[PDB]
């Protein structure tokens, strides 16, 4: 419980200029302008064909294991999914020596695709699959998630051993890997600014990490299109902005990096 202040992007550029070890905590809002809706209750979207009480939960996987595959398949097949300007900005911010890692709840792989080098995926990742009898791992790529791939032909996909593949993502009701959390915790432990970008409503995961960042008396900035659970509880500043307006921050920091010519 505490008093959050509104700041501009220009002003965030200045906060980041002083900093040696910035961390970004990212939620679905950073994939929205890549064409995947965060609302999730929108009817202008995919989440609509499918009951989130079934595909979203581990009870739902064991009863209807085809359903989370259908959802991943239709999102991959039916939408143009590309790195946006926000992802490019974060990649620059790493390049310039500011951003040390990204802790994320998205499962879509975009931060890596943009060139980030230390992405901690707390909810896992849609490009691997595990057999939930023998634990054989299978690596996948975008092209294998298409509706026409052999791997999608019969759902849920089947291991040679006779078991069934499960995506390697953490569903509601499951437990986030303690190792991955300790990783995220230590990256926060050493940081001097946490950027919390595109997150809600929340989920226990991001929240617990912000609590941890307060415990460690760390400086927190939200970049969001709106107030969130942690505004006025845990964030020190808040920037009202879309993930991709972040290239303005990257611009200000790159051109100041051109204090580079002699004299």
């Amino acid at each position: 419980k505490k008093d959050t202040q509104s700041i501009t992007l220009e002003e965030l550029a200045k906060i980041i200029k002083k900093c040696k070890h910035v961390v970004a905590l990212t939620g679905s809002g950073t994939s929205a302008e890549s064409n995947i809706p965060s609302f999730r209750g929108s009817s202008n979207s995919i989440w609509s064909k499918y009951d989130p009480r079934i595909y979203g939960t581990i009870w739902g996987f064991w009863k209807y294991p085809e359903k989370i595959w259908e959802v991943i398949r239709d999102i991959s097949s039916d939408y143009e999914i590309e790195i946006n300007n926000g992802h490019v900005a974060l990649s620059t911010l790493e390049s310039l020596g500011y951003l040390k890692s990204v802790v994320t709840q998205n499962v879509d792989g975009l931060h890596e695709a943009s060139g980030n080098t230390k992405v901690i995926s707390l909810h896992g990742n849609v490009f691997e699959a595990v057999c939930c009898t023998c634990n054989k791992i299978v690596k996948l790529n975008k092209i294998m998630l298409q509706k026409t791939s052999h791997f999608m032909h019969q759902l849920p996909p089947e291991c040679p051993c006779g078991g069934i593949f499960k995506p390697n993502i953490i569903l509601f009701g499951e437990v986030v890997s303690s190792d991955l959390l300790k990783e995220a915790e230590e990256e926060i432990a050493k940081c001097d600014l946490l950027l919390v970008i595109g997150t809600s409503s929340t989920v226990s995961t991001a929240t617990n990490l912000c609590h941890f960042a307060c415990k460690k008396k760390k400086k927190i900035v939200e970049i969001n299109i709106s107030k969130t659970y942690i505004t006025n509880k845990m964030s020190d500043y808040h920037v009202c902005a879309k993930f991709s307006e972040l290239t303005k921050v990257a611009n200000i920091l790159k051109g100041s990096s051109e204090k580079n010519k002699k004299i």
Binding site: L171, G173, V175, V176, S204, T207, N208
Partner: peptide, 7 residues
């Protein structure tokens, strides 16, 4: 227990 849960 760090269960993924709805906030």
């Amino acid at each position: 227990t760090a269960r993924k849960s709805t906030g």
